[PDB]
Amino acid sequence: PKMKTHKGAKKRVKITASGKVVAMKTGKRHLNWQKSGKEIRQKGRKFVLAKPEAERIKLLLPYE
Amino acid sequence: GNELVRRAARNLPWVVTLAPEGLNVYDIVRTERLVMDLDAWEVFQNRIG
Amino acid sequence: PVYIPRPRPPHPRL
Amino acid sequence: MKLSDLRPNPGANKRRKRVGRGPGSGHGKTATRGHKGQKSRSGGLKDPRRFEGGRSTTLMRLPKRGMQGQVPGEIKRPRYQGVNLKDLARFEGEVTPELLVRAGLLKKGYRLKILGEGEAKPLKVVAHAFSKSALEKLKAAGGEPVLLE
Amino acid sequence: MRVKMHVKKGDTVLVASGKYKGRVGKVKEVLPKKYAVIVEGVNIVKKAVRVSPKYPQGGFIEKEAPLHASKVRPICPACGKPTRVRKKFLENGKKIRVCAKCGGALD
RNA sequence: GGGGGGAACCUGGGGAACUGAAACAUCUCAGUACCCAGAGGAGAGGAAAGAGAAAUCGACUCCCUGAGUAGCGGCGAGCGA
RNA sequence: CUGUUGGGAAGCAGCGCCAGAGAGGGUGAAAGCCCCGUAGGCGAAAGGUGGGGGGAUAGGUGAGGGUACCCGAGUACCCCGUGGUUCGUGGAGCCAUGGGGGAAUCUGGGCGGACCACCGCCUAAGGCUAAGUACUCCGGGUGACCGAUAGCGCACCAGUACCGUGAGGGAAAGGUGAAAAGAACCCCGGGAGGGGAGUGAAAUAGAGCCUGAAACCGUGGGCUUACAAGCAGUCACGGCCCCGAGGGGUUGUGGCGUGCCUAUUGAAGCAUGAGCCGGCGACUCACGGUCGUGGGCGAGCUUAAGCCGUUGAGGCGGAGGCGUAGGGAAACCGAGUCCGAACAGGGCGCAGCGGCCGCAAAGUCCGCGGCCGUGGACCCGAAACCGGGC
RNA sequence: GCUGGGGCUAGGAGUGAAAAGCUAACCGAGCCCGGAGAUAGCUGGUUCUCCCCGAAAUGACUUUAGGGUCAGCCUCAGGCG
RNA sequence: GGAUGACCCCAGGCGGUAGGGGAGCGUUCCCGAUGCCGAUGAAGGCCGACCCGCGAGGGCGGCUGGAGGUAAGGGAAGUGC
RNA sequence: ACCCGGUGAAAUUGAACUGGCCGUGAAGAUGCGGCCUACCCGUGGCAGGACGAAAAGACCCCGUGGAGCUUUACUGCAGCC
Numbered sequence A: 001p002k003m004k005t006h007k008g009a010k011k012r013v014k015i016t017a018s019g020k021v022v023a024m025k026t027g028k029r030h031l032n033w034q035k036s037g038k039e040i041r042q043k044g045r046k047f048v049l050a051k052p053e054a055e056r057i058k059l060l061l062p063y064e
Numbered sequence B: 001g002n003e004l005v006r007r008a009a010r011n012l013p014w015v016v017t018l019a020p021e022g023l024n025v026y027d028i029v030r031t032e033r034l035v036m037d038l039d040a041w042e043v044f045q046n047r048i049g
Numbered sequence C: 001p002v003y004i005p006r007p008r009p010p011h012p013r014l
Numbered sequence D: 001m002k003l004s005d006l007r008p009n010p011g012a013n014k015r016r017k018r019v020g021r022g023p024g025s026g027h028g029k030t031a032t033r034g035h036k037g038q039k040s041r042s043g044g045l046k047d048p049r050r051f052e053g054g055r056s057t058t059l060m061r062l063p064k065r066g067m068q069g070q071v072p073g074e075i076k077r078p079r080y081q082g083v084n085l086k087d088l089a090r091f092e093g094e095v096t097p098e099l100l101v102r103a104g105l106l107k108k109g110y111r112l113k114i115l116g117e118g119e120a121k122p123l124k125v126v127a128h129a130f131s132k133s134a135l136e137k138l139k140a141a142g143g144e145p146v147l148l149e
Numbered sequence E: 001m002r003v004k005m006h007v008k009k010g011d012t013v014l015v016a017s018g019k020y021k022g023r024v025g026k027v028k029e030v031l032p033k034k035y036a037v038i039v040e041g042v043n044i045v046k047k048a049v050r051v052s053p054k055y056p057q058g059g060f061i062e063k064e065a066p067l068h069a070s071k072v073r074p075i076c077p078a079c080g081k082p083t084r085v086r087k088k089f090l091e092n093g094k095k096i097r098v099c100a101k102c103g104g105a106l107d
Numbered sequence F: 001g002g003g004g005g006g007a008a009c010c011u012g013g014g015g016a017a018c019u020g021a022a023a024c025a026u027c028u029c030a031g032u033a034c035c036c037a038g039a040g041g042a043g044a045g046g047a048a049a050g051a052g053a054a055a056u057c058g059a060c061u062c063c064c065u066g067a068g069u070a071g072c073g074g075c076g077a078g079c080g081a
Numbered sequence G: 001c002u003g004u005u006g007g008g009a010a011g012c013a014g015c016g017c018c019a020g021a022g023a024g025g026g027u028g029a030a031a032g033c034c035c036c037g038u039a040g041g042c043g044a045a046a047g048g049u050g051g052g053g054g055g056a057u058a059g060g061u062g063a064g065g066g067u068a069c070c071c072g073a074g075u076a077c078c079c080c081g082u083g084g085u086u087c088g089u090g091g092a093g094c095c096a097u098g099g100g101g102g103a104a105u106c107u108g109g110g111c112g113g114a115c116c117a118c119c120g121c122c123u124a125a126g127g128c129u130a131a132g133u134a135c136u137c138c139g140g141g142u143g144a145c146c147g148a149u150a151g152c153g154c155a156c157c158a159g160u161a162c163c164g165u166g167a168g169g170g171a172a173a174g175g176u177g178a179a180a181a182g183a184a185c186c187c188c189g190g191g192a193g194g195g196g197a198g199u200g201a202a203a204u205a206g207a208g209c210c211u212g213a214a215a216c217c218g219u220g221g222g223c224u225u226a227c228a229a230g231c232a233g234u235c236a237c238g239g240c241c242c243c244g245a246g247g248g249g250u251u252g253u254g255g256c257g258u259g260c261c262u263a264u265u266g267a268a269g270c271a272u273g274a275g276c277c278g279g280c281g282a283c284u285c286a287c288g289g290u291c292g293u294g295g296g297c298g299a300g301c302u303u304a305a306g307c308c309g310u311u312g313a314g315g316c317g318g319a320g321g322c323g324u325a326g327g328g329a330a331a332c333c334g335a336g337u338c339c340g341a342a343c344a345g346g347g348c349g350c351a352g353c354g355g356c357c358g359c360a361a362a363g364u365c366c367g368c369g370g371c372c373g374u375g376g377a378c379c380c381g382a383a384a385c386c387g388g389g390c
Numbered sequence H: 001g002c003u004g005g006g007g008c009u010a011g012g013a014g015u016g017a018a019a020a021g022c023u024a025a026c027c028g029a030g031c032c033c034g035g036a037g038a039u040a041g042c043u044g045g046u047u048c049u050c051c052c053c054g055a056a057a058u059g060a061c062u063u064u065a066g067g068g069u070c071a072g073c074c075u076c077a078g079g080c081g
Numbered sequence I: 001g002g003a004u005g006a007c008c009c010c011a012g013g014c015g016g017u018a019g020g021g022g023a024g025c026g027u028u029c030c031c032g033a034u035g036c037c038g039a040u041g042a043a044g045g046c047c048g049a050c051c052c053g054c055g056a057g058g059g060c061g062g063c064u065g066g067a068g069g070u071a072a073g074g075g076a077a078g079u080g081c
Numbered sequence J: 001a002c003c004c005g006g007u008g009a010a011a012u013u014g015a016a017c018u019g020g021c022c023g024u025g026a027a028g029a030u031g032c033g034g035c036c037u038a039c040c041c042g043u044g045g046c047a048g049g050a051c052g053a054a055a056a057g058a059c060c061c062c063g064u065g066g067a068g069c070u071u072u073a074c075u076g077c078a079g080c081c
């Protein structure tokens, strides 16, 4: 039958107009008191996934 | 479209018979020459417009 | 042959 | 042109890759599968899009973000699809959302908004919304924006 | 329901093919289950017979072999030719076989 | 009048496990397999105490589409209007 | 219809003819015209049907004004326990209801995802209703379906023989020939079998029957071998036999030489499988995806289910899908947008070749190929777990 | 005490002077048919020919260690030069 | 070189397991086919020291066999032990 | 048991034209090397080898395989309060 969108992927990731895959930084869910402002600031930003891993995630989102 | 004329020619081994509504390319290519009503030529002129 | 004679037991190699 | 003349172009009808049919084929015995893995077996591996050998997968270590939703699901609000002026360069007279659905421009069930990219033409354009740029361009080119509802 | 026999016992038929093509003879017998007929004087064969009552001295006797009923064509008792059988109805309402060449009846 | 039978099909009452989750328990398999009762040439359903936002539609069944959408989910595997 | 080869004509030859019929199967080989059929027509006393045409019956039918009489009860409704829904306790409604409590009759009541208000929708607690839908024991039609190890387990006296206490398991086995003309009679023999005779176009087509492969067994002939060391071959030369400046068969001597497959760092290996032969035997299909590719169209491309037509004819159908705009959790903004106080900075975004026409192309549709996902998903193999039976 | 005939008790069940004995010639959970083509990261096997190229047995992570994901190393198409 | 396999010349590459890629052969079936090969002998079988092809194969001839077979060009697979 | 007459199996079996020593070899060779020995084929006997046959090693390990059994392992259910 037709494929199903993986819902972990859709809920974590976004495919950009040229086909890149972008995700929130990791590291600021907790244990943040002793972390630099530079570290909390830099991780507030999105980041492009490495190409081998992005092309895997894209196969999980066949209807975007 | 002449039912009488198709009935006359259906049995000739060298004749495929056809109504204009059924003009296909397999039967055209299957055969060496083509013969059409001017009524049916109008029908072919519509279907490729 | 629906009856198979059971195999002899192996020499104990312990 | 007779039936002995009907021919596919070169490359239209490639042959298939029959495996496990002999030494000469280059594909015999192991059927191009190599030796003795889970991947060699009928049923192969888990989904190689996700499975990473038992470790936490690269996808599941990334955090989620945003509103995912909750029962009873999507909230019905008006949806807005945009159309740039350059797209309108083909029409004369009046533009309406109804007129643009048939052009293959504005999908059904979407409110029409005109956008700036392009060049305004002296048209009557009826639409649910206009950007600041498209509005400005349109007045200047003699066209009449008509904000409907 | 029934096997269709263009020919019947007793009428004269021509054998149109085989070794005996050209022969003419009365239909001695019709075997519907085998789609065949026995024609007088046609298709003779040699049957060995054991020494027995009704056959002392033994040896061989000549019997007539069957012909596929398709190799037989009735000879029109009027015009005298072989013909296919038509079906003509009568004023009685009944239906008889009739010659195709001329219009005669064959019964 | 009933009783019993009928290859699949149908409705109701009950209702697994292997398996999948590369372990497993919630979850999956699946209201499937199967047991039972009933029905008929079909069975079910059916004429709004409906839908759900159109200041709308207008019984029910079925097909296409909506849509792998909305959602659901040890937010896992998956499930899925 | 005739002639001709032939056991046999339908083959071949000469001259015709039909065709609303040149689908197909037979007939001694290959037939429009020999047979059965086919096109096109016709047909029911009796039984079944009859959804269509007709008739009949049951049945159906207005206002204003007043009155507030009735409008489905252990029900609604609330709570407890659960089920159904995409909804797994979740903000958890709706629908159902096992337990407790327990109303009203339209100023009644339920619903629109806790709740409340407003605005609306609908009238629970009785029942019935064709069609469009599913299936295939049964009849028929048609196959880029099988052709006797295949196709149903069964082409055949098969759910049999046989196996099992039983539930249950479950086979193998088709073909003489055109016609039995199925071989009188004689000879050897107890018979079986054979040898003659005879039939047949053909009898190593003789019923233990079409074709008749291979393993395997044997008779006859050529070459060869009893001082020789071997994965059996190969290279060379010589001898002998055969076929007719060459070739084939055989092998005496000399040289060289560690089976096949599998698994392995590594096998001739004293590691695995195989007695030998014949047949069966393992990477596919569907739908989705992702590249590549042959075409069509191109800011567009494309239809699904259905409807009409055909009876191996194609057409219609634009519902919908992909694409034409991105950015943001979103409100929203938009060639920009988000973070930010910012006009800061950054993240993700945005912009053909020829001479108005031609070639091209975003895209998209179809075909094809490779690979992926869901399915048993390359084939064979457990020990086990569950259900109902015996 | 031994024995004939007639009966009853069975599958997580029976019966057992107890051996996990026996329950139709293999019982630490009978037999059949079914779920079913369970699942098998394991072993085996995988069939015509020619041509070009041609690896790896490492690193990281892994209830991972004889299995995998990514990189490394091979091959094909297109582009650069 | 000639002008885009139309053949020739010169030079270089051409061991190969896992594996990537290319080009071919053969099997069954469909169109081609109301055709054409066929009893003056179909397919199948048995020989061959002969012809073509690198090969897989294909011819041709003789014996057997006795009624089918099927081209150039394409199409689809239960396709080679 | 042996010989003659009658009837006549089996497991096993890559093929076999199947010698010794000292070496060599995946580490225990009829099969490789160098020597030595040896005319061809049996019958009755013996078991040292063919890592002889039989049984896809019970031991041992491995498998995120199974099953029985235990308990102050986890989590439930019957039962009982």
Ligand SMILES: [Mg+2]
Pocket: A007, A008, A009, A011, F075
């Ligand atoms: Mg998730």
Ligand SMILES: [Mg+2]
Pocket: A011, A012, A013, A014, D065, D066
């Ligand atoms: Mg996102």
Ligand SMILES: [Mg+2]
Pocket: A028, A029
């Ligand atoms: Mg936080």
Ligand SMILES: [Mg+2]
Pocket: A034
């Ligand atoms: Mg610090």
Ligand SMILES: [Mg+2]
Pocket: A035, A036, A037, A038
């Ligand atoms: Mg700081």
Ligand SMILES: [Mg+2]
Pocket: A032, A033, A035, A036, A037, A040
């Ligand atoms: Mg800080």
Ligand SMILES: [Mg+2]
Pocket: A041, A044
């Ligand atoms: Mg910040």
Ligand SMILES: [Mg+2]
Pocket: A063
């Ligand atoms: Mg979509």
Ligand SMILES: [Mg+2]
Pocket: B010, B011, B012, G022
């Ligand atoms: Mg015709």
Ligand SMILES: [Mg+2]
Pocket: B009, B010, B011, B012, B013, B014, B015, B016
């Ligand atoms: Mg015709």
Ligand SMILES: [Mg+2]
Pocket: B013, B014, B015, B016
């Ligand atoms: Mg024709």
Ligand SMILES: [Mg+2]
Pocket: C001, C004
């Ligand atoms: Mg056995």
Ligand SMILES: [Mg+2]
Pocket: C005, C006, C007
């Ligand atoms: Mg044994």
Ligand SMILES: [Mg+2]
Pocket: D013, D014, D015, D016
């Ligand atoms: Mg193909």
Ligand SMILES: [Mg+2]
Pocket: D015, D016, D017
């Ligand atoms: Mg290929």
Ligand SMILES: [Mg+2]
Pocket: D018
């Ligand atoms: Mg092939």
